[PDB]
Design an enzyme around this catalytic site. Sequence first.
Site, PDB file in Angstrom:
ATOM      1  N   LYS B  66     -55.660  18.679  69.225  1.00 53.08           N
ATOM      2  CA  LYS B  66     -54.633  19.165  69.859  1.00 53.08           C
ATOM      3  C   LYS B  66     -54.107  19.539  71.173  1.00 53.08           C
ATOM      4  CE  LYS B  66     -53.909  21.332  65.762  1.00 53.08           C
ATOM      5  NZ  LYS B  66     -53.605  22.658  65.131  1.00 53.08           N
ATOM      6  N   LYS B  78     -63.477  26.545  66.344  1.00 59.29           N
ATOM      7  CA  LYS B  78     -62.649  27.306  65.103  1.00 59.29           C
ATOM      8  C   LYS B  78     -63.769  28.395  64.738  1.00 59.29           C
ATOM      9  CE  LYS B  78     -58.795  26.906  63.464  1.00 59.29           C
ATOM     10  NZ  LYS B  78     -57.564  27.086  64.140  1.00 59.29           N
ATOM     11  N   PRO B 117     -54.900  33.846  64.990  1.00 62.18           N
ATOM     12  CA  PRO B 117     -54.857  33.978  63.831  1.00 62.18           C
ATOM     13  C   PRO B 117     -54.623  32.633  63.262  1.00 62.18           C
ATOM     14  CG  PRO B 117     -53.155  34.668  64.630  1.00 62.18           C
ATOM     15  CD  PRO B 117     -54.057  34.195  66.058  1.00 62.18           C
ATOM     16  N   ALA B 185     -45.141  31.264  56.203  1.00 60.88           N
ATOM     17  CA  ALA B 185     -44.817  31.172  57.831  1.00 60.88           C
ATOM     18  C   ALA B 185     -43.894  29.902  58.306  1.00 60.88           C
ATOM     19  CB  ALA B 185     -45.574  32.107  58.455  1.00 60.88           C
ATOM     20  N   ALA B 239     -49.007  23.439  53.574  1.00 63.61           N
ATOM     21  CA  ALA B 239     -49.850  24.543  53.068  1.00 63.61           C
ATOM     22  C   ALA B 239     -51.305  24.049  52.685  1.00 63.61           C
ATOM     23  CB  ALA B 239     -49.565  24.881  51.647  1.00 63.61           C
ATOM     24  N   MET B 240     -52.027  23.979  52.354  1.00 63.98           N
ATOM     25  CA  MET B 240     -53.427  23.192  52.190  1.00 63.98           C
ATOM     26  C   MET B 240     -53.684  21.618  53.222  1.00 63.98           C
ATOM     27  SD  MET B 240     -52.407  22.492  49.519  1.00 63.98           S
ATOM     28  CE  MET B 240     -52.922  21.619  48.436  1.00 63.98           C
ATOM     29  N   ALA B 260     -47.107  20.586  58.667  1.00 54.17           N
ATOM     30  CA  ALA B 260     -47.874  21.778  59.643  1.00 54.17           C
ATOM     31  C   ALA B 260     -49.328  21.972  59.775  1.00 54.17           C
ATOM     32  CB  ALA B 260     -46.894  22.683  58.981  1.00 54.17           C
TER      33      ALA B 260
HETATM   34  N1  LIG Z   1     -49.398  28.136  63.932  1.00 52.76           N
HETATM   35  C1  LIG Z   1     -49.570  28.087  62.953  1.00 52.76           C
HETATM   36  O1  LIG Z   1     -48.939  28.757  61.084  1.00 52.76           O
HETATM   37  C2  LIG Z   1     -49.909  27.118  61.862  1.00 52.76           C
HETATM   38  C3  LIG Z   1     -50.420  26.339  63.462  1.00 52.76           C
HETATM   39  C4  LIG Z   1     -50.936  24.655  62.957  1.00 52.76           C
HETATM   40  C5  LIG Z   1     -51.251  24.452  61.575  1.00 52.76           C
HETATM   41  N2  LIG Z   1     -51.109  25.324  60.643  1.00 52.76           N
HETATM   42  C6  LIG Z   1     -50.888  25.095  59.568  1.00 52.76           C
HETATM   43  O2  LIG Z   1     -50.241  24.694  58.751  1.00 52.76           O
HETATM   44  C7  LIG Z   1     -50.184  25.473  57.217  1.00 52.76           C
HETATM   45  C8  LIG Z   1     -49.461  26.680  57.307  1.00 52.76           C
HETATM   46  O3  LIG Z   1     -49.873  28.136  57.574  1.00 52.76           O
HETATM   47  P1  LIG Z   1     -49.137  28.881  57.374  1.00 52.76           P
HETATM   48  O4  LIG Z   1     -49.913  29.529  58.847  1.00 52.76           O
HETATM   49  O5  LIG Z   1     -47.351  28.808  57.891  1.00 52.76           O
HETATM   50  O6  LIG Z   1     -49.404  29.587  57.009  1.00 52.76           O
HETATM   51  P2  LIG Z   1     -48.982  31.009  55.049  1.00 52.76           P
HETATM   52  O7  LIG Z   1     -50.578  31.880  54.507  1.00 52.76           O
HETATM   53  O8  LIG Z   1     -47.472  31.217  55.892  1.00 52.76           O
HETATM   54  O9  LIG Z   1     -48.102  29.398  54.055  1.00 52.76           O
HETATM   55  C9  LIG Z   1     -48.996  29.145  52.828  1.00 52.76           C
HETATM   56  C10 LIG Z   1     -47.885  28.958  51.984  1.00 52.76           C
HETATM   57  O10 LIG Z   1     -48.609  27.741  51.262  1.00 52.76           O
HETATM   58  C11 LIG Z   1     -48.450  28.265  49.940  1.00 52.76           C
HETATM   59  N3  LIG Z   1     -49.892  27.235  49.456  1.00 52.76           N
HETATM   60  C12 LIG Z   1     -50.516  28.090  49.301  1.00 52.76           C
HETATM   61  N4  LIG Z   1     -51.752  27.181  48.786  1.00 52.76           N
HETATM   62  C13 LIG Z   1     -50.362  26.893  48.220  1.00 52.76           C
HETATM   63  C14 LIG Z   1     -50.903  24.730  47.388  1.00 52.76           C
HETATM   64  N5  LIG Z   1     -51.149  24.838  46.690  1.00 52.76           N
HETATM   65  N6  LIG Z   1     -49.447  24.135  46.712  1.00 52.76           N
HETATM   66  C15 LIG Z   1     -48.098  25.101  46.914  1.00 52.76           C
HETATM   67  N7  LIG Z   1     -48.154  25.480  48.521  1.00 52.76           N
HETATM   68  C16 LIG Z   1     -49.177  26.666  48.308  1.00 52.76           C
HETATM   69  C17 LIG Z   1     -48.420  29.875  49.686  1.00 52.76           C
HETATM   70  O11 LIG Z   1     -48.541  30.268  49.018  1.00 52.76           O
HETATM   71  C18 LIG Z   1     -47.587  29.947  51.163  1.00 52.76           C
HETATM   72  O12 LIG Z   1     -46.898  30.388  51.471  1.00 52.76           O
HETATM   73  C19 LIG Z   1     -52.021  25.813  57.346  1.00 52.76           C
HETATM   74  O13 LIG Z   1     -52.689  24.438  56.608  1.00 52.76           O
HETATM   75  C20 LIG Z   1     -52.268  25.234  58.961  1.00 52.76           C
HETATM   76  O14 LIG Z   1     -53.343  24.802  58.607  1.00 52.76           O
HETATM   77  C21 LIG Z   1     -50.016  25.964  60.642  1.00 52.76           C
HETATM   78  O1  LIG Z   2     -53.116  24.525  66.455  1.00 55.78           O
HETATM   79  C1  LIG Z   2     -53.468  25.510  64.775  1.00 55.78           C
HETATM   80  O2  LIG Z   2     -54.069  25.408  64.040  1.00 55.78           O
HETATM   81  C2  LIG Z   2     -53.151  27.489  65.162  1.00 55.78           C
HETATM   82  C3  LIG Z   2     -52.811  27.780  66.890  1.00 55.78           C
HETATM   83  C4  LIG Z   2     -53.884  28.378  67.011  1.00 55.78           C
HETATM   84  C5  LIG Z   2     -54.295  27.857  68.910  1.00 55.78           C
HETATM   85  C6  LIG Z   2     -55.320  28.873  69.139  1.00 55.78           C
HETATM   86  C7  LIG Z   2     -56.140  29.691  68.774  1.00 55.78           C
HETATM   87  C8  LIG Z   2     -55.944  30.214  67.375  1.00 55.78           C
HETATM   88  C9  LIG Z   2     -55.033  29.571  66.223  1.00 55.78           C
END
Ligand SMILES: NC(=O)c1ccc[n+]([C@@H]2O[C@H](COP(=O)([O-])OP(=O)(O)OC[C@H]3O[C@@H](n4cnc5c(N)ncnc54)[C@H](O)[C@@H]3O)[C@@H](O)[C@H]2O)c1
Ligand SMILES: O=C(O)CCc1ccccc1
EC number: 1.4.1.20
Lengths: 347, 349
Positions: B66, B78, B117, B185, B239-240, B260
């Site tokens: 990334k 991580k 986070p 989120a 989600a996951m 995501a």
């Molecule tokens: N910057 C970021 O926020 C970010 C950046 C990179 C990648 N991601 C990836 O995006 C994903 C989103 O995480 P987030 O930060 O938005 O967290 P988050 O906790 O806000 O979102 C997770 C959501 O998914 C739901 N969820 C969990 N298990 C589930 C299932 N089995 N079926 C359906 N829904 C389910 C939860 O209820 C929750 O509302 C993560 O896997 C993360 O690894 C997020």
């Molecule tokens: O892309 C991600 O998984 C999360 C974003 C992030 C970037 C740098 C440090 C912590 C989390």
Amino acid sequence: SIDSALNWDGEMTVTRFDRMTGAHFVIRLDSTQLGPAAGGTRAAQYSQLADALTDAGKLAGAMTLKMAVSNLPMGGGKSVIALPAPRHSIDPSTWARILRIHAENIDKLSGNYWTGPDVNTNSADMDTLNDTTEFVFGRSLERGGAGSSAFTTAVGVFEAMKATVAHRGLGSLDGLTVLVQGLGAVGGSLASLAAEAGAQLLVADTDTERVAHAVALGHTAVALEDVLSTPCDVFAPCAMGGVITTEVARTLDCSVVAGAANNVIADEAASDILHARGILYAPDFVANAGGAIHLVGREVLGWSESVVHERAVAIGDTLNQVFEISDNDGVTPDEAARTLAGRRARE
Amino acid sequence: SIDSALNWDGEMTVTRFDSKTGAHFVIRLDSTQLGPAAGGTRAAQYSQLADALTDAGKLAGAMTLKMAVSNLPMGGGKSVIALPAPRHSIDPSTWARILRIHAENIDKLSGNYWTGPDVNTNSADMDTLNDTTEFVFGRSLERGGAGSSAFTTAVGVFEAMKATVAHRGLGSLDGLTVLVQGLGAVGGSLASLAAEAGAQLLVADTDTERVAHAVALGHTAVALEDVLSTPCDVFAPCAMGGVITTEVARTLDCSVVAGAANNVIADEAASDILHARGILYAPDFVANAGGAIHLVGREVLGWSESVVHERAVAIGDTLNQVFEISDNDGVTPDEAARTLAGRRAREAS
Ligand SMILES: NC(=O)c1ccc[n+]([C@@H]2O[C@H](COP(=O)([O-])OP(=O)(O)OC[C@H]3O[C@@H](n4cnc5c(N)ncnc54)[C@H](O)[C@@H]3O)[C@@H](O)[C@H]2O)c1
Ligand SMILES: O=C(O)CCc1ccccc1
Ligand SMILES: NC(=O)c1ccc[n+]([C@@H]2O[C@H](COP(=O)([O-])OP(=O)(O)OC[C@H]3O[C@@H](n4cnc5c(N)ncnc54)[C@H](O)[C@@H]3O)[C@@H](O)[C@H]2O)c1
Ligand SMILES: O=C(O)CCc1ccccc1
Ligand SMILES: [K+]
């Protein structure tokens, strides 16, 4: 064991694997409370990874206590290199690669850990290490290091040995039978000292040449397999550790136990046995502290050669205080030792 | 197996065990070649320690990519905190201890690792970490952090979906059926952007008020258990991770995959299956870069919000390029993208 491998309570564990050489790297930091961690770099072949992790962990501990009970401003740490093959078989180019990566790992810790030589590592390697990182003790005199600390180590162990012998009520080393296991750097120095002091020398070493020569000097050879069964006044383990198991404790034929090895006692119960059996053991971590005094004293504190020598001799005194406590409170020396380190650390 | 977990190629693995909490701590440093490693703090419950280990590493690996592909001057790492109980049962106290302990480890690496986070972790926890260590990203605004990367993530993910859909031959998002798994989120916001683009939404989430809510907004909810059996145009796993198994890759009913989540692909063959089934997949490490972009962009690079935005948006652009490689070279988008990450990395030197 798994407990000792995964459930260790030290402050940090660092690992790494190199497919290229097939070697594994372990750095265990037990405590950085009294200062950055410092500990050797042992390179050896292990049956399993867990044995590597176990060792790094027990050694790191010894380091922590050793530094505290000796009044050194540093914490306890240790580095283990799990070799894919016997050290002697490793080819120069690989050795060097391995050393390179290790150094990379230390540098990441950025002064939280300082290494030095241990089993199968030397001043030349330290120098080599120092080409990548600064967190190294024991580089050769030419590079700015304090060099080798065996002698300081052996001096410490001799003084300790003498203190233990007096306390036990045996008088002096004169006319005592000392069994030295491991005729290495320190081991061999210690024999010179004891011989000179009137003791009869019984010796054993995986190395025949070593043995042959001691024999040359007028010493007596002991077959590796008769070691722990051989009667003496004093037993000086100066080779590998974990030598005194519960079974060895109940069968050892001696009155005193004083050597250089780290982690002599395998299990807590063994230590109780020796005690119960009228066998006066000088805690390894107190006794073998001359090497640390040397590296730290010189490299860190900038102490001259004499001072270091004199501080290493003072190891005997520490023991006397240990012996006083064990005797007062009715604890084993080991515990007694643990108690004084704690007090010196002002815990 | 631990031994197996230990048979990893990362630059470094840091581990600690806290008797008192019974929490295990993991920090895997994939690469620090482009710069210090960086990656979020994932707090979760693991079956085994080897599991936490495999994860931190899998994730650490994604981060290295990334950063590179996103033209970010950092490496990847991580942290994974293996919980002794579910996150929710953890008392605020224990949690604080765990945080502190977490923060010490980081401190030991002295800047070689920057955190942020992740799952079960937020701005606040970063503020706490910040009480001990200074190498934290995503701190509260008032603390001086750039705050929440969520919205940038969604934008980026959004932009990627559109480009993907487009390359597929679906034209616009207008009229398409989007299935959003996990409306947290990130997903929450993506739904929102997809909605206004004209897409139709199917939603899913363990949280019932979140579902109740989306429902009230016109959205059609989906049963959990029926999440992978629902026909759609676009599948957005928000989600996951590892939701895409070999077996799931073969039965999936959609024309595009764009979410995501980190580590969408549970397995190699899965990416080949989708590719062969004609389901176009936007590589996760590419599309979910929005958050790293924001964090680094602002907190390291000292970038404007607007700029960060253009960059999150430029994610499509990168995906166009990825596709292109995939199409000319005869490779999965997964491969075409690592390649690109590889090139950008070298040129970046
Ligand atoms: N910057 C970021 O926020 C970010 C950046 C990179 C990648 N991601 C990836 O995006 C994903 C989103 O995480 P987030 O930060 O938005 O967290 P988050 O906790 O806000 O979102 C997770 C959501 O998914 C739901 N969820 C969990 N298990 C589930 C299932 N089995 N079926 C359906 N829904 C389910 C939860 O209820 C929750 O509302 C993560 O896997 C993360 O690894 C997020
Ligand atoms: O892309 C991600 O998984 C999360 C974003 C992030 C970037 C740098 C440090 C912590 C989390
Ligand atoms: N400063 C030091 O050098 C120092 C400081 C503290 C503690 N120690 C401990 O002392 C021990 C080693 O001391 P050293 O550096 O002189 O060792 P070294 O590596 O030179 O010693 C190797 C010696 O041990 C012999 N040996 C190995 N296995 C043996 C066995 N089963 N029986 C007999 N001899 C055997 C070798 O043949 C050789 O004579 C270790 O436990 C080390 O951690 C040494
Ligand atoms: O005491 C030991 O067994 C090893 C001594 C040591 C001390 C400090 C750095 C490296 C080795
Ligand atoms: K005598």
